[PDB]
């Protein structure tokens, strides 16, 4: 059985405030520009997961007002999170994606008559905006995400070329810089679509992921998410076909065959164009403090291992600015005198209030903690599973201060609590 | 007469939690691909009824924590439903359907033409999205559904070919996989329309049904539904015109006749294209626990015969993903190198909380239960129309557990009840 | 104004941007309301050449 | 490596710098901020309306 953290962990009155100051990121929104050396210009987009790993100072090592209250030998200390605020800058906007060579044959919403069959390479330049999403979750461990990937066929008759690949639901760990579902599907677009011309340049060679809430809610300890908030909306603007041989033709008994110019049945693979709706400021989730009181698991906002994970997605501020640089000058506006660039800029401000907590190490409590987590007991005196993973690292070792009123979020906290 | 279940059932303080775990369905969204052998790929769509038949363990044989708290001879036991949660996965989206050859003579919104005559086979490739619908129902017996079917023509003058078929309101049982109405009506499209080119592919060969709320509410005992929620919306996007010989010509007195090419009055059968405005996370019903407090009828959430029926329709997550496979590779993007496939995937996680109840079988109670349902008495010591019906069987015989706080719905239930 | 194609419903590969393909364009802006009170003039932020 | 090369007039990839046109939705009288008094009860900072 699993017990609640309220039993063996006792909280204290020692509150602290920390903040990451301004965080900036500037880069291309579609692909990361790289010269022969490496990525000079990274890839920064508004449809990416932002995963912050904040590293906290060790409670035992750093300075305290007095050590007479706690016992160094029979007790230990951990940091617990009790509030946060995520502040964003830059004006509200909408980001536009697209593909120079996208697979789209006809717009079938409203038409007249038939036209001929597709030739070779019937591809057009298409731009659009995506489904509107904004979410934020917090936890001790990196969150899990699901997608649909190609499956491995066991020993059987060898499949002929062109067959439909088997599908599997794959669960992985979300790292910093992964894309989000955009109303086209939460699937591996690099393995399951070989033509590389069915979705825009953002996700045509990447994996879109969706948060796997069903299983992160069924974790025995619930370290993956303390809390989460989400808001999504979209609608369908346009409808169209695709060009390519149909793997599974329409059954002979579902349609009545036509003659003359209606003989060859047109393609029946229908796709739509997603679109987020009106952007507003009264629907925002950010620039607002959140007070953690009760968690949905058993782990009630207690940070193990002196680190914490914050996952953010915000597509409401995703304007791609456009820059122009003059190569030369001419008489009357030559079009080849200018060079056009795209940038996207992102700004963050993470603020937290933490609380100091103590754990009494009896024999059975020690055995229980060892069963839960061996690294916790090992550290109270190695290779982490985050060796190859990617995160945005934010260090807060020298940024703890008990002058709560001197900082904007501390005053809000003092108003809320009152003491 | 009829008496409420509250009169003759007594409730205990024993609670159990059952979870079906993750459930998946993958298949084609329009039809089912069967080779010469069998049906390898089923038909899975978001516009289908989901009927789960949940099978509970027999409380009599099931080993209770206490067997001495009840009389083994003068009393029996039965499971009473207390609360439930339906969990959906996958991101929100919309699904596009259509017909490669659909009956649409002309556009009449901002076009009206009196030029040439309508020739044979004026059909066009048309794609759309349906009406937005959500509903959830819970009961002991499968729900009733009403549609409009061809009536029986009795001993009378023999009808000529082409006469209007008589209409009848037919009530039936909603089974698994039966479609739902999409803004075209609730009729047997297979029998009332013969051309097979009037509605999209996924309904042009089946029956679309609508729940029969009036009769299910008028039922005396109240076993058809304890609980239902619905939410639907649509609007009319495009107006068009059907092509064919007109059965009932417009009366002379209603119009002033024309001349030249206006002498032939155009078709007067007017149809529209439905749509659903917007999908948003603030209008959803699922991923939320419902506490079944008081039933609408007399059956107050009592499960007779160790059965349960849960009916779900949810069109808010209905994206049809598109997969591509590469037959061959050529120099520069031939269209015939690639094969296109359509798939839909649906994921559930049903969670229930049940309570234990006991019945004292006096003379009046035995007679009343015999009048109501003889199977309940015959079981306490068999041909059933459910034998030939198709549902989704969810077995929970070895998934009952009283460790309430170790499961998410258990935590929500304990917090809500307070005690 | 510098605009070439309406990629919403277009994309035919039948031409290339020549010289001076600018067209007359009108529109309405994003809708805003704001009211600030302070003793000192407020600060503003923009993106400038480095 | 992000695209499969075309042929004929598809050989030269078209422009990929995508821009949109903003627009406010609806002007209404129930969404105004002005023509209504405001009372400064408590300031956010330390300076309390001095």
């Amino acid at each position: 059985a699993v017990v609640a953290t309220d039993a063996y962990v006792k909280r204290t009155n020692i509150f602290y405030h920390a903040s990451s100051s301004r965080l900036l990121a500037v880069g291309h929104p579609y692909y990361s520009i790289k010269k022969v050396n490496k990525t000079v210009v990274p890839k920064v987009s508004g449809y990416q997961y932002r995963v912050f790993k904040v590293v906290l100072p060790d409670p035992n090592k750093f300075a305290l007002p007095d050590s007479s209250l706690f016992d160094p030998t029979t007790q230990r200390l951990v940091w617990a999170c009790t509030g946060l605020e995520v502040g964003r800058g830059q004006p509200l906007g909408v980001g536009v994606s697209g593909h120079p060579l996208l697979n789209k044959y006809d717009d079938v919403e409203n038409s007249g008559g038939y036209g001929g069959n597709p030739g070779q390479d019937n591809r057009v330049n298409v731009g659009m905006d995506y489904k509107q999403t904004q979410l934020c979750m917090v936890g001790c461990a990196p969150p899990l995400g699901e997608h649909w990937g190609k499956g491995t066929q066991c020993s059987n008759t060898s499949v002929q070329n062109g067959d439909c690949p088997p599908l599997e639901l794959i669960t992985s760990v979300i790292q910093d810089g992964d894309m989000v579902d955009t109303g086209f599907g939460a699937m591996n677009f690099a393995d399951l679509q070989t033509n590389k011309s069915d979705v825009p340049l953002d996700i045509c060679g990447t994996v879109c992921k969706y948060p796997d809430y069903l299983q992160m809610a069924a974790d025995p300890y619930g370290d993956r998410l303390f809390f989460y908030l989400r808001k999504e909306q979209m609608f369908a603007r346009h409808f169209f076909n695709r060009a390519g041989t149909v793997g599974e033709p329409v059954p002979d008994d579902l349609l009545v065959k036509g003659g003359n110019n209606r003989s060859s049945v047109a393609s029946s693979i229908y796709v739509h164009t997603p679109s987020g709706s009106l952007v507003s400021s009264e629907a925002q989730l950010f620039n607002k403090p959140y007070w953690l009181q009760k968690a949905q698991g058993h782990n009630n906002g207690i940070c193990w291992g002196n680190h914490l994970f914050v996952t953010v997605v915000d597509t409401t501020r995703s304007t791609n600015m456009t820059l122009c640089a003059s190569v030369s000058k001419s008489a009357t506006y030559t079009n080849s005198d200018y060079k056009e660039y795209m940038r996207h800029v992102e700004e963050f401000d993470l603020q937290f209030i933490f609380q100091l907590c103590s754990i009494t190490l009896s024999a059975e409590v020690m055995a229980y903690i060892h069963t839960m987590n061996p690294s916790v007991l090992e550290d109270w005196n190695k290779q982490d599973p985050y060796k190859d993973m990617s995160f945005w690292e934010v260090n807060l070792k020298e940024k703890f201060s008990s002058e709560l009123d001197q900082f904007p979020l501390g005053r809000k906290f003092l108003l809320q609590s009152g003491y | 007469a009829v008496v409420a279940t509250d009169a003759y059932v007594k409730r205990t303080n024993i609670f159990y939690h059952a979870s079906s775990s993750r459930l998946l369905a993958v298949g084609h969204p329009y039809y089912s691909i069967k080779k010469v052998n069998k049906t390898v790929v089923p038909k899975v769509s978001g516009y289908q009824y989901r009927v789960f038949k949940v099978v509970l363990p027999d409380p009599n044989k099931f080993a209770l924590p206490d067997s001495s708290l009840f009389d083994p001879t003068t009393q029996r036991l039965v499971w009473a439903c207390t609360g439930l949660e339906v969990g959906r996965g996958q991101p929100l989206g919309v699904g596009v359907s259509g017909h490669p050859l659909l009956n649409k003579y002309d556009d009449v919104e901002n076009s009206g033409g009196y030029g040439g005559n309508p020739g044979q086979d004026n059909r066009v490739n048309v794609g759309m999205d349906y009406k937005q619908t959500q509903l959830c129902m819970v009961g002991c017996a499968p729900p009733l559904g009403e549609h409009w079917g061809k009536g029986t023509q009795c001993s009378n003058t023999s009808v000529q070919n082409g006469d209007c078929p008589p209409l009848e309101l037919i009530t039936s049982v909603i089974q698994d996989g039966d479609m739902v109405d999409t803004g075209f009506g609730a009729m047997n499209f297979a029998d009332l329309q013969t051309n097979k080119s009037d509605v999209p592919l996924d309904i042009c060969g089946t029956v679309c049904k609508y729940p029969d709320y009036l009769q299910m509410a008028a039922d005396p005992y109240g076993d058809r539904l304890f609980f239902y929620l619905r939410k639907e919306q649509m609007f009319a996007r495009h107006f068009f015109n059907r092509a064919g010989t007109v059965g009932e010509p417009v009366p002379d007195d209603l119009l002033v006749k024309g001349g030249n090419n206006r002498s032939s009055v155009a078709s007067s059968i007017y149809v529209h294209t439905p749509s659903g405005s917007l999908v948003s996370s603030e209008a959803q019903l699922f991923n939320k626990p419902y506490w079944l407090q008081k039933a609408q009828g007399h059956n107050n959430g009592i499960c007779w015969g160790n059965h349960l029926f849960v009916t779900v329709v949810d069109t808010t997550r209905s994206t049809n993903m598109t997969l591509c496979a590469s037959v061959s590779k050529s120099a520069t993007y031939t269209n015939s190198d690639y094969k296109e496939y359509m798939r839909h995937v649906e994921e559930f996680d049903l969670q229930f909380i049940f309570q234990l109840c006991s019945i004292t079988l006096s003379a009046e109670v035995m007679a009343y239960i015999h009048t109501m349902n003889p199977s309940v008495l015959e079981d306490w010591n068999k041909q059933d129309p459910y034998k030939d019906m198709s549902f989704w069987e969810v077995n929970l015989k070895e998934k009952f557990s009283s460790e309430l706080d170790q499961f998410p719905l258990g935590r929500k239930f304990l917090l809500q009840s307070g005690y | 104004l510098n605009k070439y194609d309406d990629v919403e419903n277009s994309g035919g590969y039948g031409g290339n941007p020549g010289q001076d393909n600018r067209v007359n364009v009108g529109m309405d802006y994003k809708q805003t309301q704001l009211c600030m009170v302070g003793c000192a003039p407020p600060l503003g932020e923009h993106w400038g050449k480095g | 490596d992000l695209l499969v090369k075309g042929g004929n007039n598809r050989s030269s990839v078209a422009s990929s710098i995508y821009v949109h046109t903003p627009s406010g939705s609806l002007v209404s009288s129930e969404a105004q901020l002005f023509n209504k008094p405001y009372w400064l009860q408590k300031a956010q900072g330390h300076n309390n309306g001095i």
Partner: antibody
């Protein structure tokens, strides 16, 4: 029994504008895509502009793009061409041509109009 | 842009004899999977709109006399009038509709001798 009648030709000063129209008689106008085709006096046939059956999409040539515009009137069954910023090189005869296929159409033409002459000089 | 060149210049054909006209493109027109050549042949008489003769480079229009014929593939195409009559004096054009912009030929003038 399908006919096409054109009207709108005449003289015009350079830099001025003009409008051409084409009317279809015995035809289901809402189905077939259509186009305008120019022919200089004494020269060959040259494409100008094309429109979809429902009027959603249009295509122009490089030398014509930006100045001309093609429009449709299905209720009145008429095809319009608006000419802006005319040059001296556009004096020619214009043809209203009907495609074969419907939605966007394969580019060969069944029936043609009679043609209307446009002159741009002093 | 695909340039279509009509190789034979304006040629005069004797009475009751076959006539041959060659059209050539700067790119391959054939689509290999379906074996379709995107080429059409038009006829125009002096002072009248041109009339369609051949489409898909092989198929013939309704009401067109069987005397005309078309052939070719890839980048070569030929139109042949099997027998010559006085009503066949006209100007013939070859059009490609493989890719935009749709271009016509320079036009060949066919006349009796």
């Amino acid at each position: 029994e399908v006919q096409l009648l054109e009207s709108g030709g005449g003289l015009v000063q350079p830099g001025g504008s003009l409008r051409l129209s084409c009317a279809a008689s015995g035809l289901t106008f809402s189905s077939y895509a259509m186009s305008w085709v120019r022919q200089a006096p004494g020269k060959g046939l040259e494409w100008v502009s094309s429109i979809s059956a429902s009027g959603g999409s249009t295509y122009y040539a490089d030398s014509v793009r930006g100045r001309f515009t093609i429009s449709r009137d299905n209720s009145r069954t008429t095809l319009y061409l608006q000419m802006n910023i005319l040059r001296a090189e556009d004096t020619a005869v214009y043809y209203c041509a009907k495609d074969r296929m419907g939605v966007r159409g394969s580019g060969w033409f069944d029936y043609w109009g009679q043609g209307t002459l446009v002159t741009v000089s002093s | 842009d695909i340039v279509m060149t009509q190789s034979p210049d304006s040629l005069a054909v004797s009475l009751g004899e076959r006539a041959t006209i060659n059209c050539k493109s700067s790119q391959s027109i054939l689509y290999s999977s379906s074996n379709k050549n995107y080429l059409a042949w038009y006829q125009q008489k002096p002072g009248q709109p041109p009339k369609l003769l051949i489409y898909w480079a092989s198929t013939r229009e309704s009401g067109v006399p069987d005397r005309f014929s078309g052939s070719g593939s890839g980048t070569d195409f030929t139109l042949t009038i099997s027998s010559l009559l006085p009503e066949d004096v006209a100007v013939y054009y070859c059009q490609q509709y493989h890719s935009t912009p749709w271009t016509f030929g320079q036009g060949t003038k066919v006349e009796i001798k």
